[PDB]
């Protein structure tokens, strides 16, 4: 059988797209044959995102896979909750509860607060980004106000690349006034590299500082210049290479040619690509369970336009939503389980510390304990 789905990828998602294709090749089943429609389009704006969503919905797809930023998340969530079209995404979780949205990135505020309480910090810096939402900043501020902490927030997102030398040096000199040595970095895999380069240039990686990379991928960024400085740093990791399945996937991943699959000749792997692989596995398992349920989920391709008013959704939408919410299978990130809302539960986040020989695991985090 054929199950038409939708695929949205931003400009520069070559690794995520290659991981998606590898997961589609690996998870093959005679019960159903998928047929995605990949539409490369930047998720920075909203008009093009709405156009791509309407184009994918006009074909009459069942599930839609795509990314979104802190700006184009509201329109995507509304279009998904209105037409009852399910959505799978490995990006940052939304605010509050939102139906017909199946996220893949676990929450990081809990693990961050746990690490802060374990390290027993009183005053530190907080460098965040405006692309991963403002929920974690509000959570940190509330925790500091409840525990009587001396925190400070500096928005490093509006820093342009022209005056990167003056802006970073000036903000670091201003932070030096308060005699603060502990800095928490909360950015994507791009700004953290610039911050590390600026710290290396200004000479702040000497022993006496402690940095925290607030992201799911700690080994993703370059760390060959910090481990030799002397300032021990800590980060969060979602995928563990010590597992048998992850090691086998890495072994079968490095052997792939770079000409066909871009970004393959690399020992490590991005957490976004691993979450995309896990999402492909979850979609495959949900479609297999739906086919085994002896239900006639097949519908006609006469959905029409997306902006139709009034729009009447179909019961297959809530059916596949419940099927996706009632799935549980292993993967690269470990155990996969969703609640009634759609957020990930029963996940294990690994805390890593950077040593002289390399990153070393010191423990794990969970939601129960």
């Amino acid at each position: 059988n054929s199950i038409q789905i939708g695929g949205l990828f931003p400009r520069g998602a070559d690794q995520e797209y290659s991981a998606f294709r590898v997961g589609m090749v690996q998870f093959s089943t005679s019960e159903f044959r998928l047929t995605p429609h990949i539409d490369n389009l930047e998720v920075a704006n909203s008009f093009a995102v709405t156009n791509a969503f309407c184009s994918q919905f006009s074909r009459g797809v069942y599930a839609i896979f795509g990314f979104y930023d802190k700006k184009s998340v509201n329109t995507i969530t509304s279009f998904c909750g209105t037409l009852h079209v399910s959505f799978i995404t490995p990006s940052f979780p939304t605010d509050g509860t939102h139906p017909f949205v199946i996220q893949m990135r676990p929450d990081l505020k809990g693990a961050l607060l746990s690490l802060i309480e374990y390290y027993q910090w009183d005053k530190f810096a907080y460098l965040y980004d405006s692309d991963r939402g403002l929920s974690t900043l509000q959570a940190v501020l509330d925790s500091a106000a409840e525990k009587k902490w001396q925190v400070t927030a500096i928005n490093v997102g509006n820093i342009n690349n022209d005056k990167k030398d003056e802006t970073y040096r000036s903000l670091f000199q201003d932070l030096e006034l308060k005699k603060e040595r502990r800095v928490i970095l909360d950015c994507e895999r791009d700004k953290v590299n610039d911050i590390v380069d600026q710290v290396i240039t200004i000479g702040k990686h000497v022993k006496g500082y402690h940095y925290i990379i607030a992201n799911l991928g700690f080994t993703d960024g370059d760390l060959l210049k910090i481990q030799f400085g002397g300032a021990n740093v800590s980060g969060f990791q979602i995928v563990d290479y010590d597992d048998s399945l992850v090691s086998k996937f890495i072994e079968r991943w490095s052997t792939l040619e770079e000409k066909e699959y871009p970004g393959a000749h690399t020992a490590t792997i991005k957490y976004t690509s691993a979450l995309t692989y896990d999402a492909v596995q979850v979609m495959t398992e949900a479609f297999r369970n739906l086919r085994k349920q002896r239900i006639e989920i097949s519908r006609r391709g006469n959905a029409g336009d997306c902006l139709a008013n009034p729009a009447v959704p179909w019961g297959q939408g809530v059916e596949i939503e419940r099927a996706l919410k009632q799935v549980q299978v292993e993967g690269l990130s470990g155990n996969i389980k969703f609640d009634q809302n759609g957020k990930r539960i029963n996940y294990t986040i690994n805390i890593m510390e950077l040593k002289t020989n390399g990153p070393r695991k010191i423990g794990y985090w969970s939601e129960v304990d």
Partner: antibody, heavy 119, light 108 residues
Framework: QAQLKESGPGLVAPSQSLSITCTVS????????VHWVRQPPGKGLEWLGV???????NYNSALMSRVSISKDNSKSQVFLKMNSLQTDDTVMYYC?????????????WGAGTTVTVSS | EIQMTQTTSSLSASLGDRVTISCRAS??????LSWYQQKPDGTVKLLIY???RLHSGVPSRFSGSGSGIDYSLTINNLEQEDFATYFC?????????FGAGTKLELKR
């Protein structure tokens, strides 16, 4: 690079099975899938069967009661055993592997071997 | 099932021309077609992906277009090695039934 070399008997009498092996060379046998398509002489090639990497198979509705493909992850060979061969089975068979380039495009395609089913 | 049937049975032309082979369909294929060329020896190779792109290694002269239920591939300039067959396979709904395909040759 990947490749696909198919092996066969070439000549077989009627009312007998047609077993053909295809050694997967250049790629893994437990990661990517493999399909078997039969090409008639001077006609359009029709899909006979497809052995998915998960273990299951997708037999076509034409010869579902006469074709059965088996997998072998150890020898990296997909044995294509076609039982109850007819008199018009004097055609060539070639196996190929699927890919993922935003469409179901079979890139890795072998040369295939010929057969002359005659009693 | 989608039974893709080629309209042109056998079309031939001279060098330096631009031929256009068509390929019909029984139902909607969602532009999930592929125009693969097959030489007379038996070696085949995929040249068109999703009926709109070109595979890695194919010549830059080969191209295609068309959406819906009727597609067609158009080459830029015919050559000596391009004079061969051209099959079409629709992998939208299993089982993927490939088309017959025409055969290009030199005219005299």
């Amino acid at each position: 690079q990947a490749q696909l070399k198919e092996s066969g008997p070439g000549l077989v009498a009627p009312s007998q099975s047609l077993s053909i092996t295809c050694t997967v060379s250049g790629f893994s046998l437990t990661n990517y899938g493999v399909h078997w398509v039969r090409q008639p002489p001077g006609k359009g090639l029709e899909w006979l069967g497809v052995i998915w990497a998960g273990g299951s198979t997708n037999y076509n509705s034409a010869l579902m009661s006469r074709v059965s493909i088996s997998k072998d992850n150890s020898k990296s060979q997909v044995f294509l055993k076609m039982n109850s061969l007819q008199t018009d089975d004097t055609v060539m068979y070639y196996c190929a592997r699927e890919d993922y380039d935003y469409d179901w495009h079979f890139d890795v395609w072998g040369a295939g071997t010929t057969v002359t089913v005659s009693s | 099932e989608i039974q893709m049937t080629q309209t042109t049975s056998s079309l031939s032309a001279s060098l330096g021309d631009r031929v256009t082979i068509s390929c019909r369909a029984s139902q909607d294929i969602s532009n999930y077609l592929s125009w693969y060329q097959q030489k007379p020896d038996g070696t085949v190779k995929l040249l068109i992906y999703y009926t709109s792109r070109l595979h890695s290694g194919v010549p830059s002269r080969f191209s295609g277009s068309g959406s819906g239920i009727d597609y067609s591939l158009t080459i830029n300039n015919l050559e000596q090695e391009d004079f061969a067959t051209y099959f079409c396979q629709q992998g939208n709904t299993l089982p993927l039934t490939f088309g017959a395909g025409t055969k290009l040759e030199l005219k005299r």
